Structure 1
Amino acid sequence: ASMYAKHSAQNYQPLLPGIKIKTLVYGELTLMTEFVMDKGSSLPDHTHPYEQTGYLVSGKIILYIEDKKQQIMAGDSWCIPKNVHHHAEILENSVAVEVFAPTREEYIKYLDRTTVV
């Protein structure tokens, strides 16, 4: 059931305007995605029944979680509990790695199978 995946510049897939996604790996309890986000894009306010914990690999965003707002730079991190409202403004081209728990089955369809193993 273990997985390895290798980095590739290909197959980051459209999710929302300005936001591309790739599911890297997943398991019994978690699922890992990489989000590639264009400067000036945004994530609209949403909720989902998965805890979402992330790390900014590169760039700069403003991450809104309920009534908090924080500027996020490379190496910063966050944890958003299940069903909590969140959104973001993307200030520079940015890359984030985010892990969902429980496994977010709807995101398995973004798995880049050309780079698994």
Structure 2
Amino acid sequence: MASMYAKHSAQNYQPLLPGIKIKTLVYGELTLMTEFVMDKGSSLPDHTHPYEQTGYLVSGKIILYIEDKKQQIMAGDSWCIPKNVHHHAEILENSVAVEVFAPTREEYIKYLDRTTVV
């Protein structure tokens, strides 16, 4: 089936934005999971995508903006951004986040680190 495992790795993070590196961990028929490695002082500009985006902060500290809201996000915090909802972020510290997209975000399939897929 669409079953897959993936092992953690410290390499193969593809650049996306200045200070923002991305890697697709796993994906299936309905979801796609990425891991965002973001550097202190960097920033995600405002963008909208036709994919629901639900996330979890593994480490670090960021400021997550959604619509009019502005919230400081630290390790263990989570968020769910519906499709086409404006969102951006300021990266205050070296942070890592796990973000799952739905439906399967076809564009990010190519970022999969196939060296770690079991």
Shorter chain as denominator, the TM-score bin is over 0.9
Q: Which whole-Å deviations, capped at 9, do the CAs of 1:26-53 have from their partners, x for residues lacking one?
A: 0000000000000000000000000000
C-alpha displacement of 1:95: 0.1
Describe the SS at the equivalent of 2:89: strand
The alignment yields a C-alpha RMSD, in angstroms, of 0.3
- The percentage of counterpart residues that share the same residue type is 100
C-alpha displacement of 1:16: 0.6
The normalised TM-score by structure 2 is 0.98
The normalised TM-score by structure 1 is 0.99
C-alpha displacement of 1:56: 0.2
Q: Distance in 2 between matches of 1:76 and 1:4?
A: 24
Moved over 2 A (4+): none
C-alpha displacement of 1:116: 0.2
Q: Which whole-Å deviations, capped at 9, do the CAs of 1:85-105 have from their partners, x for residues lacking one?
A: 000000000000000000000
Describe the SS at the equivalent of 1:115: coil
Tell me which residue corresponds to 1:56: 57
Between Structure 1 and Structure 2, how many residues are aligned?
117
Tell me which residue corresponds to 2:14: 13
Describe the SS at the equivalent of 1:83: coil
C-alpha displacement of 1:69: 0.3
Describe the SS at the equivalent of 1:109: helix
Q: Distance in 2 between matches of 1:16 and 1:92?
A: 16
